[PDB]
Ligand binder design. Structure first.
Ligand SMILES: [Cl-]
Ligand SMILES: [Cl-]
Ligand SMILES: [Cl-]
Ligand SMILES: [Cl-]
Ligand SMILES: [Cl-]
Ligand SMILES: [Cl-]
Ligand SMILES: [Fe+3]
Ligand SMILES: [Fe+3]
Ligand SMILES: [Fe+3]
Ligand SMILES: [Fe+3]
Ligand SMILES: [Fe+3]
Ligand SMILES: [Fe+3]
Ligand SMILES: [Fe+3]
Ligand SMILES: [Fe+3]
Ligand SMILES: [Fe+3]
Ligand SMILES: [Fe+3]
Ligand SMILES: [Fe+3]
Ligand SMILES: [Fe+3]
Lengths: 143, 143, 140, 143, 140, 143
């Protein structure tokens, strides 16, 4: 049966989002355990984080094998070239819309240190977009 | 000013979600570059993934320093103990509600291989919850 | 002392093969532990794998010190330039002969998906050979 | 798929796995020489190509397992986690009870006492690994 | 040949300090490159850092082979048991004397947040000392 | 905060950084001995405690930078990415033009020719590092 347009397609997407966050959160928590001298706690958080990597990648396998799109971009991710095109689309959204819009709202609401951070991130994602565009030109057979 | 109840609080949350997904996606794409013999593409994806780690952790710093909750659980993450309690709450949600509910829907919709995966993940998150509960008992001064 | 023609020369080569396989096997097994929710088991597999890295590298130390060749390629691996030349030799054998031959036999025996995997790898090792060839100019 | 047992393709998957396993170890060993001598581009290329050879080795193991073939190193099944630990125990046991003590005896007879001492250190290490894996297996079977 | 009392003994110790600092510095700098969107710069910092690891480890090889002590603790580091005893010695000096003394001076000079950081580290190194003490029984 | 320049606390942050830097290197070196001998629990403890000493070193650098102090290794500022690369160039330059060639001359005079050859290999490596960092700095300033 086709996964397109099913509740299961949406559930694979939401599963991916949650697993992605769990890995990031557990590695961030491990640095607090590190500073305070809890190596066994830090090691458990890092080992469980590898479990959450495996879960995230398995969600993406069912997504890709089912012909579903990338949770982050709604672009196909069947081939390497499509994977780089998904990277470019996400970076482009972040520097041309998401982070400048967040920075404007942070300045309006009275949070200039947060706005400066969002402005730093917009410049970073613009750089990432350009580096991925240069890879895509080489994959397609150019300089 | 207090970040609680602001558009900027919500934007930090959404920024964290996107950065988490970007790191997972780029490491997954790097394994396709690896198999096909593109070490420079794989290396770029892994180096840009470190950038997305830095971005995710900086969002969590502004969240924690502002007294906002964990994007994944809506629990506080100021202290190590609160961080482990956030881990336990997320694992508990996944094995007692999220993954069993996804498995039931996958079976109803005619996707038994996806349901078996969700059932495997529910058993994994139950194990993770128990391991974190054992750490929390030790942090609080017990065996 | 010179290891040429001894049983110990062959035993170091077989030791290197087994230690290389053990690291790869234990990291593969760790991913199964990861998905199923066994973080202590996965962490032990990963720490024991570091032991098998140390074992493999020490066999290569004795091979090089005893004037023996690279177990994979039968080329000398004394200097960094020699090491990159051994890498190029192995990659060239794999893309020009080994993987295409594996793919032909897999097609003949009725394993079409395994044949396509061998063809993907033949293309990959050609790419690896190119990248190594383009750094030789740094080593003279 | 057809059964792989007894075919030349079965033998080729095993030899492929051996060569890929050696390539990763060789390239990481070479990278440490490039590190000490001041060639960071070459070192990073060796490390990225080594990730390629990991992907290749793991893909060979995927086909081996999916076609009901045994572990190239031990001739034991590797379908379940318990079977994977039993294969680790069988390999460690062969190494400390037969392979390394036999190698050490021959090294001493042939006039290589420092190589014999190395093989004796390795036999003690694999004995220790075997005991640690046997303790894990007991925990797995006990729930 | 015995390095005791030579200028080369002291030079190996200063080499080890500088190489240790260089690895930490370059990985810290890499995180700034990461946040700002410079993946080529971050990757070069990380690869050069691997070079400084190889340099530090080779200085420790010559220190141990020449019968010298651990640069950090002045304890021998020949055997694994000695290595864990050196770790315990350093951790014990840091929690019983060094970090509490740093915290007292920081309070005296008017740096309250830096004092609290030194106190967090004194507690951390006490924990490290305990964990190492509890593995000694494995080494006899 | 008060200015840190010229205080004992400034000197203590520098010595703290030196000790933390050595602890990480020492513990990773010890872990390789535990690896070869068959002590994976001890090896993993050394590796996890080493992550603790990374967190400690980086926190010392945070206070150093935030209080306008210079890099402990070079006495150069490390506030911006460009300053961080200039500090890397100054340290590499000192090492290949003064420190390692002087060490090599003394080793040869004192009868340690293999130690002298090592110091000469290191001088060539740091020369190579200095050139690679100078190329990065040129790219940074040029946009
Ligand atoms: Cl702990
Ligand atoms: Cl490439
Ligand atoms: Cl477990
Ligand atoms: Cl290079
Ligand atoms: Cl860059
Ligand atoms: Cl152990
Ligand atoms: Fe999970
Ligand atoms: Fe990005
Ligand atoms: Fe980002
Ligand atoms: Fe979990
Ligand atoms: Fe081994
Ligand atoms: Fe290759
Ligand atoms: Fe390969
Ligand atoms: Fe073993
Ligand atoms: Fe160095
Ligand atoms: Fe410590
Ligand atoms: Fe410390
Ligand atoms: Fe350097």
């Amino acid at each position: 049966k086709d996964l397109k347009g099913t509740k299961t397609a949406e559930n694979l997407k939401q599963g991916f989002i949650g697993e992605s966050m769990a890995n990031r959160r557990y590695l961030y928590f491990a640095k607090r355990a590190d500073e305070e001298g809890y190596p066994e706690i830090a090691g458990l958080l890092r080992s469980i984080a590898e479990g959450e990597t495996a879960h995230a990648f398995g969600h993406l396998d069912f997504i890709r094998q089912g012909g579903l799109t990338d949770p982050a971009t709604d672009k196909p991710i069947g081939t390497l070239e499509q994977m780089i095109e998904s990277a470019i689309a996400g970076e482009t959204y972040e520097w041309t819309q998401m982070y400048p819009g967040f920075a404007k709202v942070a300045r309006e609401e009275g949070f200039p240190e947060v706005a400066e951070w969002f402005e730093t991130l917009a410049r970073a994602e613009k750089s990432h977009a350009e580096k991925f565009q240069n890879v895509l030109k080489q994959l397609k057979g150019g300089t």
